[PDB]
Amino acid sequence: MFDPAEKYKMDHRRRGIALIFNHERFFWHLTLPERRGTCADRDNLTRRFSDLGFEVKCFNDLKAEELLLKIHEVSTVSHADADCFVCVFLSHGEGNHIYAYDAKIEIQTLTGLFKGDKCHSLVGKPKIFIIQAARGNQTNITEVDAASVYTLPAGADFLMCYSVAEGYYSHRETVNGSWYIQDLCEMLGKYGSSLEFTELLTLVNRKVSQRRVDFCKDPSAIGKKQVPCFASMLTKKLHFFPKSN
Amino acid sequence: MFDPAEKYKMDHRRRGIALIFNHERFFWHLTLPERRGTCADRDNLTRRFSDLGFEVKCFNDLKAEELLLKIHEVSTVSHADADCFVCVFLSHGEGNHIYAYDAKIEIQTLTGLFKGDKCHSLVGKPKIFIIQAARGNQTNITEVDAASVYTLPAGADFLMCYSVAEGYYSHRETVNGSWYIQDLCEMLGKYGSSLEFTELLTLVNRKVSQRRVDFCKDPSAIGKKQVPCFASMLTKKLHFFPKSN
Numbered sequence: 001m002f003d004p005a006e007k008y009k010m011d012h013r014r015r016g017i018a019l020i021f022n023h024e025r026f027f028w029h030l031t032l033p034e035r036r037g038t039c040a041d042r043d044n045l046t047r048r049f050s051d052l053g054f055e056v057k058c059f060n061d062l063k064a065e066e067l068l069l070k071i072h073e074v075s076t077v078s079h080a081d082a083d084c085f086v087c088v089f090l091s092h093g094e095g096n097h098i099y100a101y102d103a104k105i106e107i108q109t110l111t112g113l114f115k116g117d118k119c120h121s122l123v124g125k126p127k128i129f130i131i132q133a134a135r136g137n138q139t140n141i142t143e144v145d146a147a148s149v150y151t152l153p154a155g156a157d158f159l160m161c162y163s164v165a166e167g168y169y170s171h172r173e174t175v176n177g178s179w180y181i182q183d184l185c186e187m188l189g190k191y192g193s194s195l196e197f198t199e200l201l202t203l204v205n206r207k208v209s210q211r212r213v214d215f216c217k218d219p220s221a222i223g224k225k226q227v228p229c230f231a232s233m234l235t236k237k238l239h240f241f242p243k244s245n
Numbered sequence: 246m247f248d249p250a251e252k253y254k255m256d257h258r259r260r261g262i263a264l265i266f267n268h269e270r271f272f273w274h275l276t277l278p279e280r281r282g283t284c285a286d287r288d289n290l291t292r293r294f295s296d297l298g299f300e301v302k303c304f305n306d307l308k309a310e311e312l313l314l315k316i317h318e319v320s321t322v323s324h325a326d327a328d329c330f331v332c333v334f335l336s337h338g339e340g341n342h343i344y345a346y347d348a349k350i351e352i353q354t355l356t357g358l359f360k361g362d363k364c365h366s367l368v369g370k371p372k373i374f375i376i377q378a379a380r381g382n383q384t385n386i387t388e389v390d391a392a393s394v395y396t397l398p399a400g401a402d403f404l405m406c407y408s409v410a411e412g413y414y415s416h417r418e419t420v421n422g423s424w425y426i427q428d429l430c431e432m433l434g435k436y437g438s439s440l441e442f443t444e445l446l447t448l449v450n451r452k453v454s455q456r457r458v459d460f461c462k463d464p465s466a467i468g469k470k471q472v473p474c475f476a477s478m479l480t481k482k483l484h485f486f487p488k489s490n
C-alpha cells in the first residue's frame with residue numbers, strides 16, 4: 001500500500017549525532033590560507049542543530065589520523081535508538097578530497113563508513129553531509145574562493161549538501177562566516193522544526209543565489225556569483241519536528 | 246516579505262519544450278553495445294511529458310554535429326512564453342560526457358547553452374536535465390551497466406536527474422526499458438500533476454532502491470543494487486499543475 005507522502009521515521013529516543021570538523025589553520029608545508037570566520041560557521045551550526053535535538057560534537061584542526069579515528073569511532077557506535085546522522089566539513093577541498101590540518105582525505109571513505117553494509121544501525125535512516133570547502137586562494141572582509149569540491153552523491157538515504165557548484169564562487173566574511181552557512185543557519189532557525197529538509201535547502205539555494213555581487217569593495221570580486229546545490233539519494237520526506245520528552 | 250512556500254511561476258501560455266536524445270546504436274569504431282529497450286524509455290517519457298503539456302521533440306541516433314545544431318537551435322529560440330525546459334539523454338556516457346552516435350560531448354556545454362547569461366528567456370525558470378547513461382559492456386533480458394556519468398550540478402534553477410550514482414548499477418530490460426525510467430514514468434502518471442517534482446524524484450529513488458537484486462537469472466548480476474539521485478540548484482517549489490485553456 002505504497003504512500004507518496006511517506007516520512008522518514010523520526011520518533012526514536014535521540015535525534016542523533018552531528019559531527020562538525022572545523023578547519024581554520026593548516027600545516028605550514030600545505031601552503032593553505034587561514035579560513036578566518038570558520039568559527040562563526042561552527043558556532044552557528046552547533047546552536048541550530050542543538051535546537052533540533054542533535055548531540056553536536058565539534059573538533060578543531062584535527063590531523064588526518066585523529067579525524068579518521070573520531071569518525072570511525074562514531075560509525076561503529078550504535079545508532080539503533082537514533083533518528084539520523086549529520087556530519088559537517090568546514091575546510092579547504094579539491095575534487096573528491098577535504099583537507100584535514102595535515103593532508104587531504106577522500107570524501108568517499110568518510111561517507112563509506114555510514115553505508116548500509118558498514119553501519120547497520122543507520123540503514124533506512126537519513127545520513128546528511130554538509131560541505132563548505134573550496135580552493136585555498138593565496139575588520140570584516142568578504143573573502144571569495146573558487147568552487148573546487150565535486151558535488152558527489154554518496155549512497156541510499158544520504159543527502160550531500162554543498163556550499164557552491166562548479167563554475168561558481170564561495171564567500172566567507174571574516175567575522176560573520178560563510179554566506180552558505182549564515183543562510184543555512186537562518187533557515188534552520190526560522191523553519192528547521194516545520195519544513196521538509198530539502199524544501200529548506202532550496203530556500204538556502206534562493207537566499208545565496210540572490211546575494212548581490214555587482215558592487216563589491218574588491219573590484220576583482222565583482223560578478224563572482226554563488227550557487228549552492230544538494231545531491232539527494234533520500235527515499236522519503238525528512239522533517240525535524242520537535243521530539244516528545 | 247520572503248516566502249518559504251514560493252512556487253516557480255507556472256502560468257505561462259505554453260509549458261515548454263522537452264528534448265529527448267535517444268541513442269540505440271553507435272558508429273562501429275566506438276565499440277559500444279546496442280541499448281535494446283531505449284525505445285520503450287523514449288515512448289514512455291514522450292507520453293508522460295506530453296500529458297503534462299510539454300511540446301516533446303524526440304531525436305534518434307544523431308551524430309555530434311546534428312545534436313549540437315538541434316540543441317543550439319532550441320537554446321536560441323525564445324522561451325519567454327514558456328514555464329520551463331526539459332532535456333533528456335538516453336545513451337552511453339563516461340565522466341562529464343554523453344555519447345552521440347559518432348563521438349562523446351561534454352554535458353557542461355549542453356547545460357551551458359541554457360545558463361542565465363546565454364538564454365535570457367529561461368532566467369528564473371526551471372531547467373531540468375534527465376540522464377540515463379552508463380558504461381557500455383562489450384526475449385526480455387535485464388542488462389546491467391556500471392555507473393559512469395558524474396552526478397554534476399549545472400547552475401541556478403537547474404535540476405540534474407541521474408539514473409544511477411557512483412558505485413551502483415543501472416538496469417535496462419530489453420523490451421520494458423530502464424528501471425529508472427519505468428519508475429520515473431509510473432510516478433509522472435500517478436503524481437506528475439499534483440506533487441512537487443523533487444518530492445516525485447524522491448519517490449523514484451525509493452522505487453528503484455527497493456528493486457530486489459538477490460535472485461537474478463544471471464548469477465553475476467546478483468547484489469548489483471541501483472540508487473538514482475538528483476542534484477538540485479532550484480530556488481523554489483516546482484509543480485506541473487494542469488494548465489488552464
Ligand SMILES: Oc1cc(F)ccc1CNc1ncccc1-c1ccsn1
Nearest residue numbers: 147148149150151152165166395396397
Ligand atoms: O561538481 C563539481 C564541482 C566542482 F567544484 C568542480 C567540478 C565539478 C564537476 N565534477 C564532478 N561532479 C560530480 C561527480 C563527479 C565529478 C568528477 C569526478 C572526477 S572529475 N569530476
